[PDB]
């Protein structure tokens, strides 16, 4: 099936006088493989998975050099934005940045990304054509006119369609023993009473890879979002994930309901119910 | 691997 590579950058200011902090992390699908942190001792890009550790010293020195340059760019950007928005130097402010590529079953280019946020909200994004920009307001219009005149979009599109996709195919081959695996969920059901007319059923999915899943409730016909409480997919911490879906039903009809599980590790989609 | 060129907003 399909695969992806992503980098995430966070840059935060402090009152004074106080120096700003910078963090970068990288991911192949749902597996983190590197990090950088300006507050840390090493001042190096560092490994976070065992397959990246087989890159030699030329690889490590080049990622470190490139990330320090990134970090000084976003230091300047914090002061620029407080100027565009007429703010003071007494607060704390946040810039974020994400870029990367998707590939298909064939391992060929599918989609690319490159976008920013200031204080929570969208600032400027590259569109899916990889040719034009979305500016969210008057300040970000200044950023757009500056990047159009210096031809930033053309150089970004080359990276995203070529280089980016080549790093990802290399990482998939080197990390084959773990990156290519797909783990099917181990499933079960729980039941607690609340009162005499209603009780909570809960459908459980455990130990799957990757994170992508769908869990939907039905009764006789199809979908309902009536107290259909579902929680965000969470990491188990050993490289697999977990999820639950739960509905509160009229007590007595606890046999007309069916839970549905869709995962790419499953040979066939799963339907299960509660037995008396 | 990350981008080899950088630019200000």
């Amino acid at each position, epitope marked *: 099936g399909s695969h992806s590579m992503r980098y995430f950058f966070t840059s935060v200011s402090r009152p004074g006088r106080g120096e700003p902090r910078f963090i970068a992390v990288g991911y192949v699908d749902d597996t983190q493989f590197v990090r950088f942190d300006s507050d840390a001792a090493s001042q190096r890009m560092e490994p976070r998975a065992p397959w990246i550790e087989q890159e030699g010293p030329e690889y490590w020195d080049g990622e470190t050099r490139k990330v320090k340059a990134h970090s000084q760019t976003h230091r*300047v950007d914090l002061g620029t934005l407080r100027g565009y928005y007429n703010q003071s130097e007494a607060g704390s402010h946040t810039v974020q940045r994400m870029y990367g590529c998707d590939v298909g079953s064939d391992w060929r280019f599918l989609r690319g990304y490159h976008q920013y946020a200031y204080d929570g909200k969208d600032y400027i994004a590259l569109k899916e054509d990889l040719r034009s920009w979305t500016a969210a307001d008057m300040a970000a219009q200044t950023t757009k006119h500056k990047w159009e005149a210096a031809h930033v979009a053309e150089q970004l599109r080359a*990276y995203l369609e070529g280089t980016c996709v080549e790093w990802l195919r290399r990482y998939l081959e080197n990390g084959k023993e773990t990156l290519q695996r797909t783990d099917a969920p181990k499933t079960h059901m729980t039941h607690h009473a609340v009162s005499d007319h209603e009780a909570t059923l809960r459908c459980w999915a455990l130990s799957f890879y990757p994170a992508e899943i769908t869990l939907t409730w039905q009764r006789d016909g199809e979908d309902q979002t009536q107290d259909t409480e579902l929680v965000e997919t969470r990491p188990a911490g050993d490289g697999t994930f977990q999820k639950w879906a739960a509905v509160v039903v009229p007590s007595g009809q606890e046999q007309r309901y069916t839970c549905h599980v869709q995962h790419e590790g499953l040979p066939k989609p799963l339907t299960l119910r509660w037995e008396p | 691997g990350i981008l080899g060129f950088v630019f200000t907003l």
Partner: T-cell receptor, first 109, second 111 residues
């Protein structure tokens, strides 16, 4: 990345028309031309961006190849004010310009 | 504009010397090159953003700094035994885009 320029040297006559070449195996997102006299700062003449684009400045006509892997510089009715070293350059992936080694032109009365 | 001074510089062998480069063009990136007679440009050192620099193709025996956006000084140390050359500085609005060159400096090192 590598840019290769051809010919290294060209010596022609006042009023001749001529073309000089710049080539690569790989694609450039933007490309520039410069003219330099010895002991002096190079002068930027043009930036090109779109595959197939044509631009004209003074007696000069610049062409960007359709695949963005080469460019040419053409002079019409060359004059002794066109004498000098002509350099092509393109956007580098590590945050610089990639340069060719140049074509040195003399125009003779 | 972008300025280098002076036009001509002259020193004894073994003497460290620093060359000037300033611009009020509002550019983020600056570059240094050396050029020998009838030869091409050779990239020494470069700087994509204030407070960061990196090595070009012939960096041995030279150093730089970038404490301010406007200025990018070059020190020729008791370098290699090859210091005599034409030195050119250049600036661009962002790194990898079109460069504007200063007027140049001639340095000659003597016995």
């Amino acid at each position: 990345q590598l840019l290769e320029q051809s010919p290294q040297f060209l010596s022609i006559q006042e009023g001749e028309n001529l073309t000089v070449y710049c080539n690569s195996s790989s694609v450039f997102s933007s490309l520039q031309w410069y003219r330099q006299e010895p002991g002096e700062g190079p002068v930027l003449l043009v930036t090109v961006v779109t595959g197939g684009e044509v631009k004209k400045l003074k007696r000069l006509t610049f062409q960007f190849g359709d695949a963005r892997k080469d460019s040419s510089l053409h002079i019409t009715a060359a004059q002794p004010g066109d004498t000098g070293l002509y350099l092509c350059a393109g956007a580098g992936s590590q945050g610089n310009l990639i340069f060719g080694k140049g074509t040195k032109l003399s125009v003779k009365p | 504009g972008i300025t280098q001074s002076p036009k001509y510089l002259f020193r004894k062998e073994g003497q460290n010397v620093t060359l000037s480069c300033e611009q009020n063009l509002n550019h983020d990136a600056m570059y240094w090159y050396r050029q020998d007679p009838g030869q091409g440009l050779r990239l020494i050192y470069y700087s994509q953003i204030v407070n960061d620099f990196q090595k070009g193709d012939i960096a041995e025996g030279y150093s730089v700094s970038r404490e301010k956006k406007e200025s990018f000084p070059l020190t020729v140390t008791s370098a290699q035994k090859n210091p005599t050359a034409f030195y050119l500085c250049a600036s661009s609005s962002r790194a990898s885009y079109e460069q504007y060159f200063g007027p140049g400096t001639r340095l000659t090192v003597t016995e």
